[PDB]
Symmetry: D2
């Protein structure tokens, strides 16, 4: 079992993967503080989850926004036990063609938003007695994914920040691990023409693209005390994408 | 949470981490076959797990043995959906010190013996339509652990066999992943001088050693369908021993 | 041996290992372009290395400072074949301590800084028939290193960027790799209490720290044509520091 | 730099990688000792390098063979400085397909073989006051390579034996590093239908198969004092095979 009688703040929780993550966690008996910069939906989402949700606005790149939400969650539910740095943005383009400003923007949200997320929540956690900080990274943060430039650098930096942090916080019973989903089906990626459904994606050994229910079960698992001895680790959720080239690619075509 | 309402053979399951994943998974709703070389212990252990547990003598390096336990599982139970490869033997000495004969024996039980398990059981899983192989590797398989010689090489072989098999079985619904515990508290390790408790093992970030219950949960999670997209992955359950040096170390002792 | 009778610009070139890499690249016939921000000391050095080198002021974070340095070399030796992105600043503090402002500051100098160099110098290398990008990183980008926060974070970022740039640039004859030097005895490091010599640094299997000359050789080897088939690679140059814990640590002291 | 004045025993030196590294090593002043099971071809190859080469018939799985050649090296030459474990056979068949006899056989040459090699030479090197052991692994040791069954499980095992040894021996001045070749143009790989040349392998970022002079050079560099601080490392000479998938593969196509 991966149950939860605690409170957790999930970022980028209005739509996408954060929405699912939150859906399952509340299902898991936890109370959730969704946080996004897209109100309309965060409002609805929490409005769907029920009495165990509460949506807050949160511009992940701002420590003020950050401290505000932390307090509010300590204030409302009485504790901050888990975090889910899930907010960020994609970069699909040939590095030579990327602008130094967009670059500065993806890293900012992807990389710093995460750090500002962690050092803020650490005190509320030393308070609880411990915490679980699941940073949602990517398959791209595990191998050199071409065409992800700024997205690539950031996601690899989230991977290292979660490790050093894991080392420093250990004695505090504060775990820090990264999750790395691969090509997962959602409306952002939907605009990428990703053939959803079994066997519809041939460049992953599993032959198919993952769905969010899949990546979310991983987060929750770590959020729980099931994994009371897991810290500074990386869990890829990509149907083998990252393990090695599939057969066809190895055969030479 | 994770539900394993299916069939699983556990290698080395009569004591320690094996028996632990035995009892825990049964609780999870699975039907377990304790395959092990200790008849007396495996008998007692299975005896106490109810009509959900069976004991069958198994020498991991004997292929005849394998085809029996696999056939009995499928006959007696109806099929085989998961295999937890937990059997092996440790090494604690400087490489130049190890006899080539010891070296081969260990690498035989640890690496070759999991190969038979995978090569054998595969046809039982393609049948049922899929399943999960969970190879119990080690912290000695994620970084170079000194003094482990044959066990180091052994376990790294498992991290690798695990991966290649996943890229191969990907599209047959057969899932394979490695599980890498760090200093866990087992009889084999109690002898060593290891002691459980907060602050009892400085040289690992969480300051202590894990118990088997914390490792099994990583296991049940992979066996369960909840991880239906985690293939060719490697999860460490070592309180950060493996993630990077300890603070004290990064500076100086 | 490793020959490089070609031209390369060296970022952070005025001092320490950026100065040693230049001292070496020149010895091997390189037309070296030292580019730092210490105009006064960078002129002393390029002066010292003779008529094989020039000095340019390069603020790594400014897109034009970058285009001018390239344009200077370009219209100076013929082309741009190699590039060593060595400029950066360190971080010695727990994450909870680093301000989000210092965080942005360091990351801007370490990550983006090297990115601006990659896309700026690229067209120069295309018109040169290809070449090699050598991104200096460190043990901090190879494992979770405590007390580095932003430096650990950007260093992992320069690792993941090298690789993605590698797969994208392969066909135009551009090789991208990251060197990963461990505790080396440079200017900034002598102030810590770091003593050079054998026996002096017990927490690395070699029991010593590295003089910059040993780190330089990797730069050059990767800059020469002797490594024509090396791309997306990562070479640790730390005396074993990131391979695994010291035997003493493994046994608990 | 890349100039030897030391004596090095290369294994599998009758033909291929061993043959190339032999030339170059000798070309950099190394007195080399070729070891092979091909008594006819190596004696030929040796006659080529001159009076700085020497052939011996060695069976890697025979410790007695090992103790003999190592004795001979220190007899004709007086010391043993390097070792290049290049012996080992391949595999290219699915897991379930391969026998338990062949597996135990490829493992024993590829893995146990390097083990005796390492265990027999270490003393000859302490006597010498230092040495460099280069174990030749493979891109199959770096990722889960499909159809490489037993060959994978040993290549991954050599990578791990290299690291734990590097640490056990560091303060002794003996470096252990693994090299990782990707699709390299040798006879059988050519007899695999591998069309040599630029652009002839679309499934590797560099778009081609490597040449042996290209893997030889990296072995040469790691064998010298030009990497005195390189221990516990792993270098990959694979044209980007390992960094990550082809742009084409990321787009799918
Ligand atoms: C890891 C996931 C699956 C994704 O995954 C998550 O689940 C997000 C959660 C999160 O962000 O935390 C976030 C971004 C992403 C890294 C993604 C991206 O960035 C942009 C593109 C581009 C689209 C396209 C068609 C074009 O250029 O038009 C072709 C080129 C290119 C580069 C390849 C295909 C994708 C779709 C690419 C690389 C596939 C992998 C992908
Ligand atoms: C892999 C783990 C962490 C452990 O792993 C698990 O618990 C999980 C997986 C599994 O159970 O296989 C199983 C035991 C073990 C292989 C272990 C062992 O055996 C014996 C010794 C020796 C004990 C002792 C007292 C001596 O013998 O002199 C002192 C010297 C010496 C050499 C120190 C190092 C250890 C402690 C050594 C090699 C470290 C790694 C260790
Ligand atoms: C990455 C390397 C190995 C180093 O790397 C190199 O030498 C090669 C690569 C490169 O040059 O970048 C560059 C500097 C450095 C980042 C380094 C640093 O900055 C300052 C300190 C501090 C010194 C001191 C006295 C204090 O300040 O309080 C005591 C506390 C503290 C926090 C302990 C650890 C180190 C030594 C710390 C963070 C460890 C990692 C270290
Ligand atoms: C590790 C390297 C890259 C190689 O490495 C080197 O080139 C030397 C350097 C080193 O030592 O790694 C040694 C051979 C090998 C492991 C190799 C092999 O064994 C046989 C085949 C077969 C060729 C072919 C056409 C068939 O004939 O059926 C189709 C099916 C099949 C199974 C797949 C592709 C390869 C070519 C396969 C598995 C790809 C990986 C390959």
């Amino acid at each position: 079992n991966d149950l939860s009688g605690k409170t957790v703040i999930i970022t980028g929780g209005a739509r996408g993967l954060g929405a699912e993550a939150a859906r399952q966690a509340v299902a898991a008996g936890a109370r959730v503080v969704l946080a996004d910069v897209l109100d309309e939906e965060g409002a609805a989402t929490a409005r769907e989850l029920g009495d165990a949700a509460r949506y807050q606005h949160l511009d992940v790149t701002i420590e003020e926004d950050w401290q505000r939400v932390v307090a509010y969650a300590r204030e409302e539910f009485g504790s901050v036990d888990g975090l889910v740095n899930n907010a960020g943005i994609s970069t699909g383009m040939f590095l030579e063609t990327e602008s130094v400003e967009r670059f500065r923007k993806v890293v900012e949200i992807n990389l710093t938003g995460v750090f500002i997320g962690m050092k803020t929540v650490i005190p509320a956690m030393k308070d609880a007695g411990g915490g679980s900080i699941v940073n949602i990274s990517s398959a791209a943060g595990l191998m050199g994914l071409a065409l992800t430039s700024s997205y690539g650098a950031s996601k690899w930096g989230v991977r290292g920040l979660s490790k050093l942090a894991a080392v420093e916080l250990g004695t505090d019973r504060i775990r820090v691990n990264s999750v790395h989903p691969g090509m997962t089906y959602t409306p952002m990626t939907a605009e990428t023409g990703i053939r959803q459904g079994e066997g519809n994606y041939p460049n992953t050994p599993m032959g198919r693209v993952g769905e969010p229910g899949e990546i979310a079960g991983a987060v929750v698992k770590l959020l729980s005390d099931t994994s009371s001895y897991v810290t500074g680790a990386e869990l890829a959720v990509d149907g083998g994408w990252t393990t090695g080239p599939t057969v066809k690619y190895v055969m030479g075509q």
